[PDB]
């Protein structure tokens, strides 16, 4: 509902340590450019130069907070960005603003790109009349998942499982390793019967039926062509009405409406995190009025 | 030098701490799916399903080494990927293979994705007759710089400075803070006269002349149109022949040939790391004869 | 239904870090006692002097692997301990055996003490004909959760959710802060509709019906005397066949039969981790012959 | 002699680091329940529902300090707890209160459970006229020693050595490795030099005399029957009056008066940290008026 | 030219982490002495008892900020110390002052010792009519480089490169491994043509000419006799006027003037961080009036 | 006694973490020089070019072991170094040898420099007939205390207390804060009666008598002239035969005989760690076949 409340999801203690490692990565030793700018109190304007959705204020704020700077936002989390928009002002000693600048922009750009992709996907789906959830994956940049799942939520998608613990997800490789879908789904059920859910990844109707018989909570139809996707889900919903159907594999902004259908509850797209270009933001010091 | 030599640039201690933190990110508690697959010895085939350049073997290796798995590659680092290619084979306990799969794949996908954009840019420059350096920027994913700068090098681009400690770069914001170009360049030269180089980002020809007169090693012409860019660089090289000229701002694979010019030495592209989609890789367990 | 394979659940990277920090805590500087013992090859015996269930071999093994010692076990993980039993042999340099001894016994004692409480509780419950799950809680020693939740599993109990990122549980305090059960539960269901489960802690029959109406996967009947409990539950399963029922509040080894009932699916006991005395083990060096 | 002033023993850099790891353990990713409570200002009351001694206010405070919450205590550290007592009030944003609640109660229950067991021991020892030190052991939970040693002090017991540094302690296993008591405490005496004391665990009157002859400061008489313990301690003090005698092994709250004696200076019980059940506390949100 | 400005080079995140690691080294567990002093407000005066240069205020300040203490300086950074001077006053709880006393004095004493040695070398060089850069090396105490490089700057020396990332330095061993100087600097030149500098360490005029002819930005003449050093530099400056010339190897304050010469740009000295004795500072609590 | 045994004191968990932080300090990103040397197998000789005592082999081994290099020592830990001497060989890949070279030489140079100062102070006191202990202090480089305390031991000196959790030490500032010598030491005697030692730092003979009378184990006569130090030590020994006497403050190599006396038990010298120059070592790659 409200993109403004999503920030309560982020534990305060994780932000500070996350942010501290990013700052150290960009300046591990002596910050020679501090001598160029000096330490006088300054003001920068944050400028939106790309269209999209604003996501990332919590991480932007945390970065500058460790550098004793303050941020005033002129747009809420989740806003549509119409270029060229003035979206915040940052205040602090000049060398601190310029030290935090690059990391803060990198984070805002990337989080917002993901939310902009997610909002477009949510839009395309509703424009085909589909009421299910658009979702992300675990195809995230390592070390950056907290930012990328947050960005999905701001854009209106579900984050899907955060990590491997999680919901027990039986994949192709698990079926092979366990010697059969029925053995794998039985082993996944025991591993947390109460209460984690079990999702099972299925390359065909007959695997999906076997997964549902063995007790899957969710059935993921993997890499179906749309023309076989919907018949398969119809049979499933008629035979196992309380099992949820997820479609996934090669779904993009463009072909997404072909994968929306009344018997698909969830559509997950790797593109939301692997192919969402970053938005264009700049931070510019200006003289005080 | 040669793409296989590049792996030596990676300090093995940093590799291990990066890899461990990525794994703890994807599985911070219990790995319930390890019960589904068990620990029996298995083999998995790495498949390349996107065209491009293969980059990131050192990280893929270090991920799996930490889980006591081994990798045999069938293509060298920097190889062209012609899909559908069988790129490697991974060996080890089934649960260790499946626990590292996603992290390893996510790393290789983004690293290869960046190397693929760099290769594409170096190609576009060479086909325009340009012998300069195509270069990356500091617009990298927070936490992930080591992989992305490594990706740039495998693709044939220069990484540019690794962080704020490796070359004193006077930007528009330093100029405003310092009171002006020549004040800012003087403080930059002090801050490490011997010996770090000083690069100055300039938005006008006069700003470029002031910076070169003030002793900049490198003058970066920022967001010039090509029609304004090349006459500026010609003037600069005429008056200051030992000052290198860089061009940057809004340069993409498509417009890259318009910015090549006999008086440009470096061309830096934020897009090589911010808008380079990841390649598609899978890892499929295959049965024991 | 096999305690030897539970070790696969422990991610190897989390084990080594945890063990390192335990060894650092017990010896932060110089280890003066190493000079008293020297470094000659030697062997110790592990002695179980308490009845119960043996749990914690992977942690015990990991501690001594960091100290270049080897361990041979004479009883599989989960075995019944009949004192005074010779449980294992540890081999390595004398000072390394004696450096690991206290941390290894401390971990094994507590992991086995918890598994022993868990096994006794599970034994009580099937002796009353019960088929549901005996479970643990988040009343764990801070920083020791991985050992204590693993111990629950070794003794046959369910771990319940590992931390706040598993199933969304709304408690009395959430209901007070949301201003009502059905508000709380409706927010909970949004926060991850697909797919994490939602569990609601209820003090009174009315609350549980509200919770179930609103979409709870699980209702926890908290602090019921067994007199009200089994009516309450058989009502709920009548009205809501599809919703799981959990009993919690003051359930101990002595009174556990009185909470076992046929419409109760899960019984969780904070005593399994808060009042589970450690078993008594010792490690004794013995001479070669 | 003043439990309020013990909090100065805890260095504040360590407290924040330990507290951050505990919070990170209980919520490693997104905190979904935060969307259920919101962030509106709230107050919770701390209820003691158990008899004992109150211990652990600095850790409790430090947890809620990291979460931007305040604590008001109505009982000083060390007070007797008569249930059901209102111990404190915690103020702050509701999600912040609910995120720290479990870890704060977990820490206070264990700390207090220990200080309550210590105070019982000091009560029983005082009831037998014994003026020596009741002390703890190194049988603490790995990772938690700071809380548990502090809890021993709050309840009137001596902590004993914190770690493997501190006093050099010759044990059964050292005597085996060094080939005799004389050799082991001569090597110990050398390592200890002038700053550390030497204590020797002795299971017979012969060992105790050899240890005292070879310069031990303390002799620990290990696993003696009470009838054998007191003559041994007496003859030792006659022959070596400068040597402190400690008794230890199987000493419990019920049998502790039997081990008290005018020639025992220290009595140590693993019981106080390995078998002290945690006190019952709760934290309940309430409406301001 | 301003010692008070150098503090801006220190990124505040790194300061906190480094400072906390030093406090934890000196007090890993309980601070027993805190009971001896109590927590009442106190004041202590910092006393300089050595002649030299004051350096290290940012580290001294940061230690005491972590401990909720405040510092007031009566001398700016880089001041000349004429003993016995009263250079600062520290205010805070009694136990926090005494907790930080030793770490802060150890830090200030080494930093000021390095700055004193650097200023002595600069004064000797200036008394020989030399105005090039006196420079440090990477012969720093491991883990203490930020303090030691900072102290070189306060004293008037150049820090030289901070680590293996600042400038590619071809040493004797690189030459041997590369199979010759031409191959080495060619490879070095490739590692970062634009733009890091390449310095080559040379033991003969012929090696230096080759290093220069092959592209070196700086030539370091290592362990020359002054009699052969100055003719060598004169040749290099005449045939390669843009290449900087460094002298290094065995250069001490007492022999430094013989190494000063019109064609030496940089003189670097291991002894500035390896043979620089610390200064004597004390911190004495004082009372009301 | 035997310096070769002292390596047993070093817990290997701590060595790896220390060493990792030092390597990361010296190369936080890409190691450009690795491309100059390549990765082929190589060898380097370790030369001692300063007189003194060899100390720090375990830290040197650990550095290279982290880089997959092996070290062969030709002299034992603690040897007298008669320059020039071939101390060791190091083998491994060329770029790993050159990556560890500086950190490994820095650690060995400071460790050996400290041991050399220790051995000379021990010999000075032996030549004066004195049988007490020469001791170090806590005037140690922050972060480096393990190497420096270790270096003292290899030189034949006592380390004195490692940190604040060793013996409780009442200093001038503690006396001022407690309001009296004699209330200070009683607070200190409580803070760990059994069993840590109490040392009191005294400026006058009356102060020593009060510390002795209130129960100090050790009395440090701080900054006495030798003329008054020995009369004072004699009174104390006569009145308090079991109290040990330390002498400290301004004691150097050349006046150490003046502080030796029959009633001084310990002499401690800040200069052993604050004014002990590092020894000169070099590591030289040499070609094979
Ligand atoms: O591991 C997960 O949590 C997870 C959640 C949702 C989807 N996936 C997988 O992500 C893949 C998405 O494919 P794509 O083409 O959109 O990159 C598909 O193979 C799914 O099985 C994986
Ligand atoms: O800070 C650096 O290391 C750096 C190196 C090269 C380029 N840049 C900046 O990157 C910008 C180019 O970004 P883009 O997205 O327009 O390709 C340009 O404005 C430069 O100032 C920055
Ligand atoms: O937060 C959890 O994960 C959780 C899981 C299971 C149970 N609990 C709570 O644990 C409590 C059990 O109390 P007790 O007497 O068994 O210590 C009961 O009040 C439940 O609400 C809490
Ligand atoms: O290592 C220590 O610091 C230490 C301090 C005091 C006692 N102990 C040992 O702890 C044992 C007491 O265990 P318990 O649970 O039987 O009372 C006994 O064998 C002592 O030698 C060990
Ligand atoms: O690696 C560096 O950054 C570096 C910078 C400047 C000098 N050095 C080396 O330092 C050595 C001089 O140190 P010293 O103790 O002989 O005065 C000489 O051999 C140089 O090669 C090394
Ligand atoms: O704090 C310690 O553990 C410690 C141990 C031994 C000596 N000291 C102090 O070291 C000081 C002697 O330093 P110095 O530089 O004059 O040789 C003297 O003032 C003692 O109080 C301090």
DSSP string of chain D, one letter each residue: --SSGGGGGS-HHHHHHHHHHHHHHH-SS--TTHHHH-S-EEEEEEEE-S-EE---HHHHHHHHHHTT-EEEESS-TT-EE-SSEEEEEEEEEHHHHHHHHHHHHHHHHHHHHHHHHHHHHHHHHHTTT--SEEE--S-PPTT-HHHHHHHHHHTT-B----SSSSSEEE-HHHHHHHTSHHHHHHHHHHHHTTTS-EEEEESSHHHHHHHHHTT-SEEEEES--HHHHHHHHHHHHHH-TT-EEEEESS--TTTHHHH--TT--EEE-THHHHS-PPPPEEEEEE---
Q: E281 has which bridge partners? A: E48
E215: burial class by Cβ within 10 Å (0-12, 13-18, 19+)? middle
Within a 10 A sphere around the Cβ of B89, how many other Cβ atoms? 16
Residue A148 and residue A112: Cα distance in Å, rounded? 9
Segment (H or E) for F184: helix F181-191
Helix (H, G, I), strand (E, B) or coil at A31: coil
Residue A221 and residue A230: Cα distance in Å, rounded? 10
Closest CA relative to residue F276, chosen from F114, F153, F78: F114
User: Please, which residues have CB within 8 angstroms of residue C97's CB and are 6 or more apart in sequence?
Assistant: C42, C44, C64, C67, C69, C90, C283, C285, D173
Closest CA relative to residue A214, chosen from A237, A198, A231: A198
Helix (H, G, I), strand (E, B) or coil at E158: strand
Length of chain C in residues, anyone? 289
Structural tokens at position B281? 């890789």
CB of residue B183 inside a 6 A radius of ligand 2: no
Closest CA relative to residue A121, chosen from A92, A148, A156: A156
**Whether B229 contacts B265, CB under 8 Å:** no
Helix (H, G, I), strand (E, B) or coil at C275: coil
Q: Which residue is listed with tokens 């799981």?
A: C244
Marked catalytic residue, from D80, D139, D197, D237: D139
User: Please, which residues have CB within 8 angstroms of residue C163's CB and are 6 or more apart in sequence?
Assistant: B29, C138, C145, D25, D26, D27, D28
Residue B163 CA, ligand 2 centroid: distance in Å = 13
Segment (H or E) for B90: strand B85-93
Asked if A28 reaches chain F (Cβ–Cβ under 8 Å), the answer is yes
Contact criterion met (CB < 8 Å) for E11 and A20? no
Asked if D5 reaches chain F (Cβ–Cβ under 8 Å), the answer is no
Residue C34 and residue B246: Cα distance in Å, rounded? 61
**Spacing of C-alpha A246 from chain mean position:** 17
CA neighbours closer than 13 Å in the CB half-sphere of residue C43? 9
In chain C, whose CA is at the least distance from the CA of F13? Answer: C20
**Whether B110 contacts B154, CB under 8 Å:** no
**Whether D166 contacts F196, CB under 8 Å:** yes
Structural tokens at position F214? 């209130």
Instruction: Name subunits touching B (3+ CB pairs < 8 A).
Output: A, C, D, E, F
User: Please, which residues have CB within 8 angstroms of residue F123's CB and are 6 or more apart in sequence?
Assistant: none
Structural tokens at position B25? 């990110």
Residue A270 CA, ligand 1 centroid: distance in Å = 6
Within a 10 A sphere around the Cβ of F227, how many other Cβ atoms? 8
Residue C158 and residue C150: Cα distance in Å, rounded? 9
Alpha-helix runs per DSSP H in E27-180? 34-37, 57-66, 94-127, 145-154, 172-178
Which residues of C line the annotated binding site? 102, 137-139, 161, 171, 201, 222, 248-250, 269-271
**Whether D267 contacts D135, CB under 8 Å:** yes
Asked if E12 reaches chain A (Cβ–Cβ under 8 Å), the answer is yes
Give the gap in angstroms from C-alpha B104 to the nearest C-alpha of chain E.
27
Architecture of domain B130-275: Alpha-Beta Barrel (3.20)
Give the gap in angstroms from C-alpha A178 to the nearest C-alpha of chain C.
14
Sign of the Cα pseudo-torsion (F246, F247, F248, F253, in order): negative
Question: What one-character DSSP code corresponds to residue E157?
Answer: -
Segment (H or E) for E207: helix E205-213
**Whether B252 contacts B226, CB under 8 Å:** no
- C80 included as an active-site residue: no
Residue B185 and residue B213: Cα distance in Å, rounded? 10
Give the gap in angstroms from C-alpha D207 to the nearest C-alpha of chain C.
16
Q: Which residue is listed with tokens 């100290």?
A: C67
User: Please, which residues have CB within 8 angstroms of residue E151's CB and are 6 or more apart in sequence?
Assistant: E55, E56, E110, E111, E112, E113, E114, E115, E118
Choose the closest CB to E8 out of A28, A29, A34. A34
**Whether F36 contacts E184, CB under 8 Å:** yes
Choose the closest CB to D174 out of C29, C98, C142. C98
Residue C223 and residue C247: Cα distance in Å, rounded? 8
In chain D, whose CA is at the least distance from the CA of E22? Answer: D13
Sign of the Cα pseudo-torsion (D178, D181, D186, D188, in order): positive
Q: Is B269 annotated as a binding residue?
A: yes
**Whether A170 contacts A198, CB under 8 Å:** yes
Residue B158 and residue B137: Cα distance in Å, rounded? 9
User: Please, which residues have CB within 8 angstroms of residue D148's CB and are 6 or more apart in sequence?
Assistant: D110, D111, D114, D136, D140, D141, D273
Structural tokens at position E273? 């961080």
Instruction: Give whole-number Cα distances, B71 to B43, B154, D54, in Å.
Output: 10, 20, 56
- Give the technique used to solve this structure: X-ray
Length of chain E in residues, anyone? 289
Residue C79 and residue E204: Cα distance in Å, rounded? 74
Residue F158 CA, ligand 6 centroid: distance in Å = 13
**Whether A153 contacts A17, CB under 8 Å:** no
Asked if C241 reaches chain E (Cβ–Cβ under 8 Å), the answer is no
Q: Which residues of C touch E23 (CB under 8 A)?
A: none
**Whether A230 contacts A222, CB under 8 Å:** no
**Whether E249 contacts E225, CB under 8 Å:** no
For residue E248, which phi and psi values (nearest 5 degrees)? Answer: -160, 150
Question: What one-character DSSP code corresponds to residue C289?
Answer: -
Give the gap in angstroms from C-alpha E28 to the nearest C-alpha of chain D.
8
Q: Rg of the Cα trace of chain C?
A: 22
Asked if A30 reaches chain E (Cβ–Cβ under 8 Å), the answer is yes
Domains F1-129+276-289 and F130-275 share a fold: no
**Whether C253 contacts C120, CB under 8 Å:** yes
Alpha-helix runs per DSSP H in B85-201? 94-126, 145-154, 172-178, 181-191
Residue C282 CA, ligand 1 centroid: distance in Å = 49
Which residues of E line the annotated binding site for substrate? 102, 137-139, 161, 171, 201, 222, 248-250, 269-271
User: Please, which residues have CB within 8 angstroms of residue C212's CB and are 6 or more apart in sequence?
Assistant: C219, C236, C239, C240, C243
**Whether B144 contacts B59, CB under 8 Å:** no
E227: burial class by Cβ within 10 Å (0-12, 13-18, 19+)? exposed
Q: C219 has which bridge partners? A: C200, C245
Closest CA relative to residue B286, chosen from B136, B122, B91, B103: B91
Instruction: Give whole-number Cα distances, F222 to F121, F251, F274, in Å.
Output: 19, 10, 18
CB of residue A249 inside a 6 A radius of ligand 1: yes
Instruction: Give whole-number Cα distances, A213 to A182, D10, F179, in Å.
Output: 8, 57, 80
Structural tokens at position C176? 């007070």
**Whether A243 contacts A79, CB under 8 Å:** no
CA neighbours closer than 13 Å in the CB half-sphere of residue D20? 14
Asked if E8 reaches chain A (Cβ–Cβ under 8 Å), the answer is yes
Closest CA relative to residue E174, chosen from A203, F285, F268: F285
Q: Give, for ligand 1, the residue of A135, A224, A266, A270 to mutate: max count of ligand atoms closer than 8 Å to Cβ.
A: A270
Residue F227 and residue B285: Cα distance in Å, rounded? 83
Give the burial string for B96-132 (b: 16+ CB within 10 Å, else e). bbbbbbbbbbbbbbbbbbbbbbbbbbbebbeeeebeb
Superfamily of domain C1-129+276-289: Quinolinate phosphoribosyl transferase, N-terminal domain (3.90.1170.20)
User: Please, which residues have CB within 8 angstroms of residue B282's CB and are 6 or more apart in sequence?
Assistant: B46, B47, B49, B105
Q: Which residue is listed with tokens 């003859």?
A: D235
Edge-to-edge order in the sheet of strand D281-286: D70-73, D85-93, D41-48, D281-286
Taking only residues 98 to 117 of chain A, the set having a beta carbon closer than 8 angstroms to any beta carbon of chain D reads none
Question: What one-character DSSP code corresponds to residue C179?
Answer: T
Q: B202 has which bridge partners? A: B221
Between helix D94-126 and helix D145-154 the angle, nearest 10°, is 50
E178: burial class by Cβ within 10 Å (0-12, 13-18, 19+)? buried
Residue B138 CA, ligand 1 centroid: distance in Å = 30
Domain boundaries, chain F: 1-129+276-289, 130-275
Q: Which residue is listed with tokens 């006991």?
A: C269
Alpha-helix runs per DSSP H in A155-274? 172-178, 181-191, 205-213, 226-239, 256-259, 271-274
Structural tokens at position B175? 């100029």
Which ligand number lies closest to the CA of residue B273?
2
Establish whether the linkage from the previous residue to D84 is cis, with ω within 30° of 0: yes
Q: Is B246 annotated as a binding residue?
A: no
Residue A125 and residue A108: Cα distance in Å, rounded? 25
Asked if F189 reaches chain E (Cβ–Cβ under 8 Å), the answer is no
Residues of F annotated as part of the active site: 139
Instruction: Give whole-number Cα distances, C265 to A193, C242, C262, E252, E283, in Å.
Output: 11, 12, 8, 81, 66
Instruction: Give whole-number Cα distances, A140 to A20, A110, B38, B79, F112, in Å.
Output: 20, 11, 26, 24, 49
Residue C9 CA, ligand 5 centroid: distance in Å = 51
Expressed in percent and rounded to 5, the helix, strand and coil fractions of chain F are 45, 20, 35
CA dihedral B164, B167, B173, B174 (to 10 degrees): 110
Q: Whose CA is nearest to atom 7 of ligand 4?
A: D137
Structural tokens at position D99? 């995120």
User: Please, which residues have CB within 8 angstroms of residue F152's CB and are 6 or more apart in sequence?
Assistant: F114, F115, F118, F135, F136, F158, F159, F272, F273
Contact criterion met (CB < 8 Å) for A29 and F28? yes
Q: How do strand D266-268 and strand D244-248 relate by DSSP bridges?
A: parallel
Q: Rg of the Cα trace of chain B?
A: 22
Segment (H or E) for A245: strand A244-248
Instruction: Give whole-number Cα distances, A162 to A56, B25, B282, F106, in Å.
Output: 18, 10, 20, 45
Instruction: Give whole-number Cα distances, A111 to A108, A115, A151, D211, E122, in Å.
Output: 5, 6, 5, 67, 51
Alpha-helix runs per DSSP H in F29-142? 34-37, 57-65, 94-127
Mutation target to probe the A interface, by most A beta carbons within 10 A, among C166, C195, C245, C247 is C195
Helix (H, G, I), strand (E, B) or coil at B47: strand
Closest CA relative to residue F18, chosen from F111, F97, F92, F98: F111
């Amino acid at each position: 509902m409200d993109a403004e409340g999503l920030a309560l999801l982020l534990p305060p203690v994780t932000l500070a340590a996350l942010v501290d490692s990013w700052l150290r990565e960009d300046c591990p030793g002596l910050n020679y450019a501090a001598l160029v700018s000096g330490a006088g109190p300054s003001q920068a304007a944050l400028w939106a130069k790309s269209p999209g959705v604003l996501a990332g204020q919590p991480f932007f704020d945390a970065i500058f907070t460790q550098l004793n700077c303050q941020v005033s936002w002129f747009l809420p989390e989740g806003s549509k960005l119409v270029p060229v928009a003035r979206v915040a002002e940052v205040r602090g000693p000049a060398h601190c603003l310029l030290l935090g600048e690059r990391v803060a922009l990198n984070t805002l750009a990337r989080c917002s790109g993901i939310a902009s992709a997610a909002a477009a996907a949510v839009e395309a789906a509703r424009g085909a009349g589909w009421t299910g959830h658009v979702a992300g994956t675990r195809k995230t940049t390592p070390g950056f998942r907290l930012v990328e799942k947050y960005g999905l939520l701001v854009g209106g998608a579900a984050s899907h499982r955060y990590d491997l613990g999680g919901l027990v997800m039986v994949k192709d490789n698990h079926v092979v390793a366990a010697g059969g879908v029925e053995k794998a789904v039985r082993a996944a059920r025991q591993a947390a019967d109460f209460a984690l859910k079990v999702e099972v990844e299925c390359s065909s109707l007959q695997e999906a039926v076997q997964a549902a018989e063995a007790g899957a909570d969710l059935v993921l139809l993997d890499n179906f062509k749309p023309e076989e996707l919907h018949p398969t889900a119809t049979v499933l919903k008629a035979q196992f009405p309380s099992v949820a159907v997820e479609a996934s594999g090669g779904i993009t902004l463009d072909n997404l409406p072909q994968f929306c259908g009344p018997h698909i509850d969830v559509i997950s797209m790797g593109m939301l995190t692997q192919a969402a270009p970053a938005l264009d933001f700049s931070l510019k010091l200006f003289a005080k009025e």
